[PDB]
Amino acid sequence: RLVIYEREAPEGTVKDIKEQEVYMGEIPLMTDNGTFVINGTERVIVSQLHRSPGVFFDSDKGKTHSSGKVLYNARIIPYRGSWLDFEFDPKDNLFVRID
Amino acid sequence: QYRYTLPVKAGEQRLLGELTGAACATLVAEIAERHAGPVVLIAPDMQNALRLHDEISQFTDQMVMNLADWETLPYDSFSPHQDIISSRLSTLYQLPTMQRGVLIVPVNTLMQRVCPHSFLHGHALVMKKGQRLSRDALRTQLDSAGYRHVDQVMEHGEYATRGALLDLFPMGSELPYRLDFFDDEIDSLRVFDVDSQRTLEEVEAINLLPAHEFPTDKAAIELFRSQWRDTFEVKRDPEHIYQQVSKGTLPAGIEYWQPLFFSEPLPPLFSYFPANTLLVNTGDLETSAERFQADTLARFENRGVDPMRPLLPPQSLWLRVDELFSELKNWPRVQLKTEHLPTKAANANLGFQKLPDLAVQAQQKAPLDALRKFLETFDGPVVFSVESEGRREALGELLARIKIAPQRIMRLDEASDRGRYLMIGAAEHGFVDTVRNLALICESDLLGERVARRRQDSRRTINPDTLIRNLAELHIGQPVVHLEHGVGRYAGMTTLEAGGITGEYLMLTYANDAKLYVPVSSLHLISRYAGGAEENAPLHKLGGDAWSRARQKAAEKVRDVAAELLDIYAQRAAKEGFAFKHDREQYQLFCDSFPFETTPDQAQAINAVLSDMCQPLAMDRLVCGDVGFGKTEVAMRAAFLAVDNHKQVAVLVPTTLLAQQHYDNFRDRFANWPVRIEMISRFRSAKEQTQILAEVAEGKIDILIGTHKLLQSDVKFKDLGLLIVDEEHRFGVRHKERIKAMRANVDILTLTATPIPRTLNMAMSGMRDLSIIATPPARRLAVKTFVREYDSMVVREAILREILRGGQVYYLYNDVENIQKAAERLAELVPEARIAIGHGQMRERELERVMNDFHHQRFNVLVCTTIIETGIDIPTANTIIIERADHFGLAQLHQLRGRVGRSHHQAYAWLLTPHPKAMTTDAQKRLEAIASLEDLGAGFALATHDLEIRGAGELLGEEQSGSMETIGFSLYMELLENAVDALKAGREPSLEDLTSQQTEVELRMPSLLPDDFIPDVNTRLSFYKRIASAKTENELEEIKVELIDRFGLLPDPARTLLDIARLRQQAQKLGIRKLEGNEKGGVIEFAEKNHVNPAWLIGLLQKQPQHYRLDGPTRLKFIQDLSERKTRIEWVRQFMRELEENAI
DNA sequence: ACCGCTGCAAGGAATAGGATACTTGCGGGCTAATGGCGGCGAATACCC
Ligand SMILES: Nc1ncnc2c1ncn2[C@@H]1O[C@H](COP(=O)(O)OP(=O)(O)O)[C@@H](O)[C@H]1O
């Protein structure tokens, strides 16, 4: 449904509005069992398990800089967008990196 | 007596008013002519300044200058182009003492501060012979500069002063100069030796201008570094400005780090004003200074970031506004403004009433009614103020229509009580000075309406009873007309949301059940049906978008090219070209007419032209080079050599405009020799065409210029000896060789800017000559060029950088359907630009209006298609913005880069790109090529980039660009020479005249011999020879059966060919000379001595007027639905069979 | 009274508009990576 604002009137008014059944895309249909028939072959999408978006605190357990020093770090992981990381210098700093 | 006294006081203001357009210029001309002292006009903006810069010289005679402003933006990243700086300081050198003269500076400059005068009066020297100055004065000025008295000067920092003669050895040059002061005046400028003390050169004015406005040496560098370490902080970076200048080299915007290069406070240029100077004002300062300062600050904290190149606060690089208005109380000041102040002292309003409505139009029967009714009732003198000389004649016959006589005067004071005069100048607007009843009328005071026309809106006048008078009791299912779209079936009222506004609407169903919901408010667009067919009403489809109608399926190859190209090439290589004759002194007297000196490469290009012209061979020379490098005078010297041998030079260009400049160039250069030079285009009338082209056969016109009109199969040169063709990369192949088809051994010279790949490759493969040119005579600019992504603020700052320079912008979009929308899209992006629209599809009068108003600076930015590619003047345009450089041919990319420039001003060129991975790979190769080469002389290698990315086209066909898997060049040469000796084997008539003697038998039907039937082009060629030379049906059939014998069956193109030849036999047998046919019918044109039965032809006409009409005496238009070409052939066959049965 | 001059009818003439067919270019549609370790140069910044 398309809205057209008439130019003569102030900001937000209706000249006219149209509507029609546009067609877009041919989405596959799952069968009654689980199968998506793609090209005469019979594919199945498997459920993916991935690391949940959110915020996690982690530490490489002293494998870096050899002092016995554990380096805590924080991740903010979006479902869609840019990542965000904080971490620790062995000299007891906080360091932010992006992407 | 004058009209008004002047401000002569420390800080008095003089208010002057009642001022309309262009009156202020002659007012300040009066000011300069009445004040013994300087006049500095402060301008509100560059544009008006530059406009006033040619205004004031129109009205008076004093020397008038701008101050060259830095061209850049505040805190920009660009050098101010040292040459401009060299102009800037130079004026600034003489600014402390300049007695008479007018200087126009803008508030952009006047708010800027300048050098502290220590550097200028120390580290620079301009000195002219007419400077009355003494000996010890210049001696102590050299002492104050710090120089040493050595009486045998050899070292920088030395000068001599013995008796009257003074010598100087500067910081700038390696040479000392002898001065020889006499009578408190300078009387020699003698460039004498470092040791031998004798003069090299006698000079009048010595120009030792510093290479910069700022000190540049070492002590300046550590002073600057001291200042930077005091102010900013230095970071370890090999691009940071501190380290960059510490290496001695310079970045672009370095001058905007001004004050660190002195360690003094900087003067506001008021220090450079003379003793009693008179400042005159225009518009106001009290507005423009504010928003300039606001822009200045806003830009400063816009770039008050970025430790890479930090900036000084603007308080050092500029005055503040209050600081200005304080220093503007230090000078006697004049304020001119465009209204009526009432009454006070130091104030006057002078009668400068704006002109009445004087305008022309073709709509009225007598166009000059306002002028013809104004002039007899204007009691005073009348002045006409034409800009151009030739445009003067555009007024000359124009007022001759109202029978009114212009006299050419020079001075505005030359007015009598009542007399009509023309003034050559640079005004833009007129007025009446009612003090003396004087009237000045500009040319632009005639054409006030730049207006379009409206259309449509038919049913809004249909207020009939079918409108239903907004009954609002309409039933569902009523077929209802809605005047923009058509008829639908009304299906009720419905509420819908619309973006925070709920509403009630009338749902209406069109075809393909597309709903349309008009508001209940605007119910008056909605009308009841009128046809009375409520249950038989149609339905419109909404939108009417029938683009789908661009699908597929067009055929080609209606006419072969390859055989004919091979034919003309063989004919050229068979005969011998003309050995021209050269006269030393006669050519030298023509060289004398050239008021310039040839660059050496240009000379040897000219020499290679003549030393190929005078040979038994045929000339075929590419004279490729960049635009503006002096190509035309090469053709001048070529044509003169050609024309004195009486050889009828023919000139070809691919547009009317280039022909128009060429007519001026040819006529003005050939101003002393008995040669008649003319042009032809569509702009010439037919009655002029019918004598020019006829006279070409007679031939007293020796030089003829034109568009494709020459190649219209009617132009008959009596002795063609020279073809010159300009702006090559057009013209296909057929138009290129269609002229050479007339004369096999004609000499061809082809000028170009960037040659097309085909003619580049054929030239580089030894078939045609090549002569490249470089090294332009004037030091032109390589207008910096960029290829960046599309960015709303990047284009904005580009537009701003151009407009606060003062010139104009070519902004090209190249899509006419949306250029109207793109206009406001740019316009609220830059609200202070002035935008007009121009493209090739307007009504062919508003376009010229737009371009002439552009030519008179009435607006700044022009949105356009590639109409500007035709190469117009107006060098004030200095910035190209190609919005979508994705889809544009690289040769005309170079051509559009040639459009800006044409000036000592540094032009700019931004090539907007889309996102790099979105575009075509070929577009990326094009843009990398154009980003690689930004110089002069780079046009040709850019054409080598045009080739080898597209493939140079087929050597024996059309399609100049393309890979195409062509004929190999070695095989090409073999086929060529085989055609050559087979041609000269027994003097075989050229195929082209077999075209001419053949009756016109065109039928819009594919008639040729296809390549699969005969691969060998010589064999197909000689078969063409044998069929068109065959004069009996017996021999036609023998050739046909021989073809069948040689290659199997006979395909349809061959069959159609052979029966058209059969038709040609009886066409030439009867006298049926011109036969055109098509789908719709066609024209049979007979001879004057024809074999037509006249009474029987009238019988045809009176039995079928629908299929026989004599439109002319022998022109028979027959109208037949010739859907099948076989039926077309048999129709014409049986028709001439009827005519030979009635032949007499 | 009768050419002399003017105002209008016409007729042709010229010119805009809107068709057609020809060239250059070139694209658009369309068929035909943020779950890893190690070496090494770069790039340091770092103390001398
Ligand atoms: N040898 C020369 N010395 C000085 N000026 C020249 C010389 N040759 C050309 N010019 C200048 O350059 C311009 C020549 O351009 P022209 O050959 O007419 O066409 P294009 O602009 O395509 O080169 C002229 O305006 C002329 O003033």
Distance CA B425, CA B384 (A): 10
According to DSSP, the β-strands at B861-864 and B835-838 are parallel
Q: Which helix (H) or strand (E) holds B737?
A: helix B734-738
Which CATH fold would you assign to the domain B561-770? Rossmann fold (3.40.50)
Indicate left, alpha or beta for B245 from its phi (over 0: left) and psi (-120 to 50: alpha).
Answer: alpha
- The distance (Å) linking the CA of B401 with the C1' of C5 is 22
Q: Which helix (H) or strand (E) holds B730?
A: none
Is A14–B519 a contact, with Cβ atoms under 8 angstroms apart? yes
Distance CA B1086, CA B1114 (A): 5
What is the Cα B432 distance to its own chain's centre?
Answer: 36
Q: What are the tokens at B1011?
A: 């390549």
What is the Cα B56 distance to its own chain's centre?
Answer: 28
B127's CB contacts (< 8 A; 6+ apart) are B186, B189, B205, B206
For residue B15, what are the β-bridge partners? B335, B347
Strand residues in B894-1028 grouped as ranges (E): 908-913
**What strand order describes the sheet that includes B515-519?**
A2-4, A16-19, B515-519, B502-509, B486-497, B479-482, B526-528
Query: Quick one: which atom of ligand 1 is closest to the CA of B751?
Result: 22
The amino acid present at B558, given as its one-letter code, is: V
Contact predicate B764/B890, CB 8 Å? no
Q: Is A11 on the interface with B (CB under 8 A)?
A: no
Q: What are the tokens at A16?
A: 């006219």
CATH code for B118-208?
A: 3.30.2060.10
Distance CA B1008, CA B557 (A): 9
Distance CA B835, CA B838 (A): 10
In 3D space, the residue among B692, B699, B593 whose CA is nearest the CA of residue B640 turns out to be B593
Cα distances from B532 to residues B474, B479, B480, B489, in angstroms, run: 16, 10, 11, 14
> What's the full length of chain A, in residues?
99
Task: Kindly give the residue spans of alpha helices, DSSP state H, lying in B532-621.
Answer: 562-574, 584-593, 600-613
Taking CA B815 as the corner, what is the angle to CA B813 and CA B816, rounded to the nearest 5 degrees? Answer: 115
Name the DSSP class of B240.
S
According to DSSP, the β-strands at B479-482 and B526-528 are antiparallel
Distance CA A9, CA B503 (A): 16
The owner of tokens 């006048």 is B461
Contact predicate B809/B862, CB 8 Å? yes
CA atoms within 13 A on the CB side of B292: 24
Distance CA B428, CA B447 (A): 12
SS3 call for B565: helix
Which CATH fold would you assign to the domain B352-445? Rossmann fold (3.40.50)
Cβ of residue B922 lies below 7 Å from strand C: yes
Question: Could you tell which of B633, B662, B936 is best to mutate to test the pocket of ligand 1, judged by most ligand atoms within 8 Å of the CB?
Answer: B633
The owner of tokens 């990326």 is B924
Burial letters B441-463, b for 16+ CB under 10 A, else e:
bbbbbbeeeeeeeeeeeebeeee
In 3D space, the residue among B272, B274, B266, B227 whose CA is nearest the CA of residue B246 turns out to be B227
Q: Which nucleotides of C are covered by protein (CB under 7 A)?
A: 14-17, 22-28, 31, 34-35, 37, 45
Method: cryo-EM
B103's CB contacts (< 8 A; 6+ apart) are B38, B39, B40, B41, B64, B65, B66, B67, B91, B95
Q: What are the tokens at B563?
A: 């055989």
Distance CA B1144, CA B1136 (A): 13
Contact predicate B982/B976, CB 8 Å? no
> What's the full length of chain B, in residues?
1144
Cα distances from B662 to residues B652, B653, B658, B1099, in angstroms, run: 10, 9, 6, 55
Contact predicate B369/B30, CB 8 Å? no
For residue B185, what are the β-bridge partners? none
For chain B, first and last CA: distance in Å? Answer: 95
Distance CA B660, CA B653 (A): 10
Contact predicate B1131/B1005, CB 8 Å? no
Distance CA B819, CA B833 (A): 17
Breaks (C-N over 2.5 A) in chain A follow: none
Distance CA B1123, CA B1080 (A): 8
Q: What are the tokens at B212?
A: 């910069």
B497's CB contacts (< 8 A; 6+ apart) are B503
In 3D space, the residue among B1012, B940, B938, B933 whose CA is nearest the CA of residue B759 turns out to be B940
Is B517–A12 a contact, with Cβ atoms under 8 angstroms apart? no
CA of B898 to the centre of ligand 1 (A): 14
For residue B680, what are the β-bridge partners? B706
For residue A36, what are the β-bridge partners? A43
According to DSSP, the β-strands at B199-202 and A71-77 are unpaired
CA-proximal residue: ligand 1, atom 11 (nearest) = B630
Contact predicate B1140/B1070, CB 8 Å? yes
The domains spanning B561-770 and B969-1142 adopt the same CATH topology: no
Distance CA B181, CA B193 (A): 19
Q: What is the largest CA-CA distance in chain A?
A: 73
The owner of tokens 């002063």 is B161
Cβ of residue A66 lies below 7 Å from strand C: no
Q: Which CATH number fits domain B969-1142: 3.40.50.800, 3.90.1150.50, 3.40.720.10, 3.40.190.10?
A: 3.90.1150.50
SS3 call for B221: helix
Q: Is A14 on the interface with B (CB under 8 A)?
A: yes
Q: What are phi and psi of B53, to 5 degrees?
A: -65, -25
The owner of tokens 């009128």 is B530
Contact predicate B112/B324, CB 8 Å? no
Distance CA B318, CA B113 (A): 6
